[PDB]
PDB file of C-alpha atoms in Angstrom:
ATOM      1  CA  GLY A  52      79.826   8.073 -11.460  1.00 32.62           C
ATOM      2  CA  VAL A  53      81.128   4.868 -13.137  1.00 31.02           C
ATOM      3  CA  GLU A  54      78.448   2.660 -14.847  1.00 31.61           C
ATOM      4  CA  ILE A  55      79.575  -0.947 -15.593  1.00 32.28           C
ATOM      5  CA  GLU A  56      77.888  -3.073 -18.318  1.00 33.39           C
ATOM      6  CA  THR A  57      78.928  -6.786 -18.442  1.00 33.25           C
ATOM      7  CA  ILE A  58      79.887  -7.933 -22.031  1.00 31.52           C
ATOM      8  CA  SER A  59      80.977 -11.506 -21.079  1.00 30.40           C
ATOM      9  CA  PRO A  60      81.183 -12.622 -17.349  1.00 27.82           C
ATOM     10  CA  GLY A  61      84.473 -13.646 -15.553  1.00 26.08           C
ATOM     11  CA  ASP A  62      85.047 -15.845 -12.433  1.00 28.75           C
ATOM     12  CA  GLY A  63      82.564 -13.647 -10.449  1.00 27.94           C
ATOM     13  CA  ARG A  64      84.745 -13.718  -7.278  1.00 25.07           C
ATOM     14  CA  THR A  65      88.483 -12.615  -7.365  1.00 25.24           C
ATOM     15  CA  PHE A  66      88.314  -8.752  -7.716  1.00 23.73           C
ATOM     16  CA  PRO A  67      91.540  -6.549  -7.782  1.00 24.73           C
ATOM     17  CA  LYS A  68      93.086  -5.692  -4.305  1.00 26.34           C
ATOM     18  CA  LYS A  69      95.522  -3.133  -2.729  1.00 27.46           C
ATOM     19  CA  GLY A  70      99.050  -3.432  -4.287  1.00 25.42           C
ATOM     20  CA  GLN A  71      98.052  -5.878  -7.124  1.00 26.38           C
ATOM     21  CA  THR A  72      99.523  -5.509 -10.694  1.00 27.93           C
ATOM     22  CA  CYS A  73      96.430  -5.604 -13.036  1.00 27.70           C
ATOM     23  CA  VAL A  74      97.205  -6.954 -16.594  1.00 26.25           C
ATOM     24  CA  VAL A  75      94.653  -5.736 -19.202  1.00 26.79           C
ATOM     25  CA  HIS A  76      94.072  -5.447 -22.982  1.00 29.22           C
ATOM     26  CA  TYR A  77      91.833  -2.430 -23.893  1.00 28.16           C
ATOM     27  CA  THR A  78      90.442   0.004 -26.523  1.00 25.68           C
ATOM     28  CA  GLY A  79      89.257   3.555 -25.533  1.00 23.32           C
ATOM     29  CA  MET A  80      86.342   5.397 -27.302  1.00 22.27           C
ATOM     30  CA  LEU A  81      84.762   8.936 -26.964  1.00 23.92           C
ATOM     31  CA  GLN A  82      81.083   9.965 -26.336  1.00 21.68           C
ATOM     32  CA  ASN A  83      79.280   8.377 -29.334  1.00 23.96           C
ATOM     33  CA  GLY A  84      80.881   7.743 -32.736  1.00 28.17           C
ATOM     34  CA  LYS A  85      84.676   7.192 -32.668  1.00 28.78           C
ATOM     35  CA  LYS A  86      87.711   5.470 -30.964  1.00 25.38           C
ATOM     36  CA  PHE A  87      90.959   7.207 -29.672  1.00 25.76           C
ATOM     37  CA  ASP A  88      93.341   4.462 -28.285  1.00 26.62           C
ATOM     38  CA  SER A  89      93.930   0.650 -28.053  1.00 30.11           C
ATOM     39  CA  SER A  90      96.360  -1.576 -26.045  1.00 29.92           C
ATOM     40  CA  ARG A  91      95.586  -4.567 -28.399  1.00 30.23           C
ATOM     41  CA  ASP A  92      96.377  -2.410 -31.520  1.00 31.87           C
ATOM     42  CA  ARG A  93      99.960  -1.732 -30.233  1.00 32.74           C
ATOM     43  CA  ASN A  94     100.844  -5.488 -29.646  1.00 33.19           C
ATOM     44  CA  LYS A  95     101.597  -5.268 -25.870  1.00 32.44           C
ATOM     45  CA  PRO A  96      99.517  -5.973 -22.665  1.00 32.05           C
ATOM     46  CA  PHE A  97      99.092  -2.928 -20.306  1.00 30.11           C
ATOM     47  CA  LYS A  98     100.199  -3.067 -16.592  1.00 27.22           C
ATOM     48  CA  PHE A  99      98.754  -0.820 -13.764  1.00 25.89           C
ATOM     49  CA  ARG A 100      98.726  -0.937  -9.920  1.00 28.33           C
ATOM     50  CA  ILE A 101      95.372  -0.383  -8.086  1.00 30.22           C
ATOM     51  CA  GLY A 102      95.438   2.195  -5.215  1.00 32.64           C
ATOM     52  CA  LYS A 103      98.797   3.873  -6.133  1.00 30.70           C
ATOM     53  CA  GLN A 104      97.108   5.997  -8.928  1.00 35.64           C
ATOM     54  CA  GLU A 105      99.299   5.207 -12.035  1.00 34.13           C
ATOM     55  CA  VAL A 106      96.167   5.765 -14.278  1.00 32.72           C
ATOM     56  CA  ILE A 107      93.015   8.038 -14.458  1.00 33.00           C
ATOM     57  CA  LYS A 108      90.501   7.563 -11.523  1.00 33.11           C
ATOM     58  CA  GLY A 109      87.622   6.003 -13.580  1.00 32.70           C
ATOM     59  CA  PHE A 110      89.991   3.415 -15.157  1.00 31.64           C
ATOM     60  CA  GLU A 111      91.369   2.539 -11.646  1.00 27.26           C
ATOM     61  CA  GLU A 112      87.862   2.147 -10.016  1.00 27.51           C
ATOM     62  CA  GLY A 113      85.960   0.405 -12.885  1.00 29.26           C
ATOM     63  CA  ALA A 114      88.788  -2.180 -13.176  1.00 28.46           C
ATOM     64  CA  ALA A 115      88.668  -2.820  -9.372  1.00 24.45           C
ATOM     65  CA  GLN A 116      84.871  -3.549  -9.418  1.00 24.61           C
ATOM     66  CA  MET A 117      85.318  -5.985 -12.412  1.00 24.78           C
ATOM     67  CA  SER A 118      86.193  -9.746 -12.059  1.00 25.10           C
ATOM     68  CA  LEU A 119      89.208 -11.812 -13.408  1.00 27.19           C
ATOM     69  CA  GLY A 120      88.656 -13.010 -17.035  1.00 28.44           C
ATOM     70  CA  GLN A 121      85.690 -10.563 -17.454  1.00 29.51           C
ATOM     71  CA  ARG A 122      85.104  -8.483 -20.632  1.00 29.66           C
ATOM     72  CA  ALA A 123      83.023  -5.333 -19.797  1.00 30.54           C
ATOM     73  CA  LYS A 124      81.990  -1.776 -20.931  1.00 28.26           C
ATOM     74  CA  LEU A 125      82.944   1.186 -18.625  1.00 27.51           C
ATOM     75  CA  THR A 126      80.676   4.237 -19.381  1.00 28.82           C
ATOM     76  CA  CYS A 127      82.507   6.589 -16.920  1.00 26.05           C
ATOM     77  CA  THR A 128      81.103  10.133 -16.303  1.00 27.94           C
ATOM     78  CA  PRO A 129      83.341  13.214 -17.215  1.00 26.25           C
ATOM     79  CA  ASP A 130      83.840  14.246 -13.490  1.00 26.11           C
ATOM     80  CA  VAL A 131      85.663  10.879 -12.890  1.00 26.04           C
ATOM     81  CA  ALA A 132      87.307  11.222 -16.392  1.00 24.99           C
ATOM     82  CA  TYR A 133      89.332  13.971 -18.294  1.00 24.95           C
ATOM     83  CA  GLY A 134      86.383  16.487 -18.124  1.00 26.58           C
ATOM     84  CA  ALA A 135      86.163  20.276 -18.803  1.00 27.41           C
ATOM     85  CA  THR A 136      89.800  21.166 -19.724  1.00 30.40           C
ATOM     86  CA  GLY A 137      90.496  17.493 -20.681  1.00 29.43           C
ATOM     87  CA  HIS A 138      94.047  16.235 -21.375  1.00 25.60           C
ATOM     88  CA  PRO A 139      95.841  19.143 -23.264  1.00 25.73           C
ATOM     89  CA  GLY A 140      96.284  18.239 -26.996  1.00 27.55           C
ATOM     90  CA  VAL A 141      94.882  14.662 -26.552  1.00 27.28           C
ATOM     91  CA  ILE A 142      91.404  14.323 -24.900  1.00 30.31           C
ATOM     92  CA  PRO A 143      88.744  17.016 -25.844  1.00 29.35           C
ATOM     93  CA  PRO A 144      86.514  19.131 -23.396  1.00 27.25           C
ATOM     94  CA  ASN A 145      83.190  17.645 -21.985  1.00 28.16           C
ATOM     95  CA  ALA A 146      83.603  13.907 -22.822  1.00 26.23           C
ATOM     96  CA  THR A 147      81.882  10.861 -21.190  1.00 24.37           C
ATOM     97  CA  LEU A 148      84.340   7.905 -21.713  1.00 23.23           C
ATOM     98  CA  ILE A 149      83.612   4.356 -23.040  1.00 24.23           C
ATOM     99  CA  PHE A 150      86.243   1.603 -22.267  1.00 21.73           C
ATOM    100  CA  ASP A 151      86.370  -1.959 -23.841  1.00 18.99           C
ATOM    101  CA  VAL A 152      88.223  -3.518 -20.815  1.00 22.11           C
ATOM    102  CA  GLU A 153      89.408  -7.235 -20.710  1.00 21.56           C
ATOM    103  CA  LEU A 154      91.057  -8.364 -17.377  1.00 23.84           C
ATOM    104  CA  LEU A 155      93.734 -10.940 -18.492  1.00 21.01           C
ATOM    105  CA  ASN A 156      95.484 -11.668 -15.116  1.00 21.98           C
ATOM    106  CA  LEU A 157      95.933 -10.187 -11.570  1.00 22.36           C
ATOM    107  CA  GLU A 158      99.575 -10.259 -10.213  1.00 20.98           C
TER     108      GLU A 158
END
């Protein structure tokens, strides 16, 4: 499943809850070698609810186990990611994901 590595630690207490609006900068990279997307690059913070499933399952569960103000690496396995078909046109077949997550503020 999901495999968190801490980059820099946060508060170490206030995790995301049911119904909370997570506010996050990010940059998404494929299995070894190259990046595919970035929220920082586009000049706008990204907003997603936990529990209501507005995003992919690995992004929703890795974020929830992280702390407020934490920077961390999410090495999510393909079964909890886009996987065998992948996202048509966008995300290729058989791909372990690597996320550069930074939890700005819970709301």
